[PDB]
Design a binder for this molecule. Structure first.
Ligand SMILES: NNC(=O)Cc1ccc(F)cc1
Length: 330
């Protein structure tokens, strides 16, 4: 089997991407944030504290003939940005782009933090990291990909995110028309539960590539590219007027600037992030200072290849017995 679904930016900055997901019988379609940096599929629901729902589409398990309460099970998660949610657990039929999993754990939110309430476009998350990070207690549950894997034509999914445009998540096959050149594959460590890999270095603009190992995670659920302070300082030093602002919370630059590209290494291959991808617009409405899309990972504890990096590539998440990541230009 295979599946293919379009993913769509939630706003004009590509802050996140939403993908329609069918849950239950008859189908209830919710728009979920596919997150390769977590492993819970959770949704706004009929059980979510009413005051914490503001415009989201909710899952109503009592209207699904295939919903089943997982007795006594609970879940609770917090994310890198400090947001969080928690609740109880159902299993139900879940389809993504024509690909169906029966008995998928669908984690129903009782509580969500303010950032989720305030984002009316995101109805939940669908985690695609390794199932070892799943937060269901007392018994951890499998991700949609893990459940689907044995049925897939190939044990893979791909992320093809757009720049200010829709893109695609495919399950079970690699669309050889969706990228240019070849896909370069690179080793993955699953020891921390993430799609963790080592980039072979970077370049700023037209500068010479610096060979240096950069461990990080491929994370579709993170907006920006977070890299060591050394790397990030070298990038912004090439932008006139750029500076790190503690009050804003990162590097800012004059909105009138022409940003250089940023290249990261995948083995002997190179992915070039155009300068425009690194502009995240005015720091506040009407400001002539703009927020940068490459920021320091110092304090996070890990480097994160978020959407700014991933949208420059066609990315293969290979869930074979020994997982790997593939990157191609497009
Ligand atoms: N969905 N991604 C996140 O919540 C960001 C993140 C991941 C791992 C980590 F160790 C720190 C932050």
């Amino acid at each position: 089997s295979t599946g293919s679904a379009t993913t769509t930016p939630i706003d004009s900055l590509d802050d996140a991407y939403i993908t329609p997901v069918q849950i239950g019988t008859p189908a209830q379609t919710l728009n979920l944030d596919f997150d390769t940096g977590s492993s819970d599929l959770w949704v706004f629901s009929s059980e979510t504290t009413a005051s914490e729902v503001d415009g989201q589409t909710i899952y109503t398990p009592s209207k699904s003939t295939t919903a089943k309460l997982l007795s006594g099970a609970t879940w609770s998660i917090s994310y890198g940005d400090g947001s969080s949610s928690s609740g109880d657990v159902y299993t139900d039929t879940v389809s993504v782009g024509g690909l169906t999993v029966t008995g998928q754990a669908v984690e129903s939110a009782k509580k969500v933090s303010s950032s989720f309430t305030e984002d009316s476009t995101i109805d939940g998350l669908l985690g695609l990291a390794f199932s070892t990070l799943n937060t269901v207690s007392p018994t951890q549950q499998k991700t949609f990909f893990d459940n689907a894997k044995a049925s897939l034509d190939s044990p893979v999914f791909t992320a093809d995110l757009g720049y200010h445009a829709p893109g695609t998540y495919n399950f079970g096959f690699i669309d050889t028309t969706a990228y240019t050149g070849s896909i370069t594959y690179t080793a993955v460590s699953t020891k921390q539960g993430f799609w963790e890999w080592t980039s072979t270095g970077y370049a700023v603009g037209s500068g010479t590539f610096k060979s240096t190992s950069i461990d990080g995670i491929a994370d579709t659920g993170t907006t920006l590219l977070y890299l060591p302070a050394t790397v990030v300082s070298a990038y912004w030093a090439q932008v006139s007027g750029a500076k790190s602002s503690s009050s804003v919370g990162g590097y800012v630059f004059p909105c009138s600037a022409t940003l250089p590209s940023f290249t990261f290494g995948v083995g002997s291959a190179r992915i070039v992030i155009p300068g425009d991808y690194i502009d995240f617009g005015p720091i506040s409405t009407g400001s002539s200072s703009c927020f940068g899309g490459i920021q320091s990972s110092a304090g996070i504890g890990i480097n994160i290849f978020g959407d700014v990096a991933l949208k420059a590539a066609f990315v293969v998440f290979n869930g074979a017995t020994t997982p790997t990541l593939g990157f191609a230009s497009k």
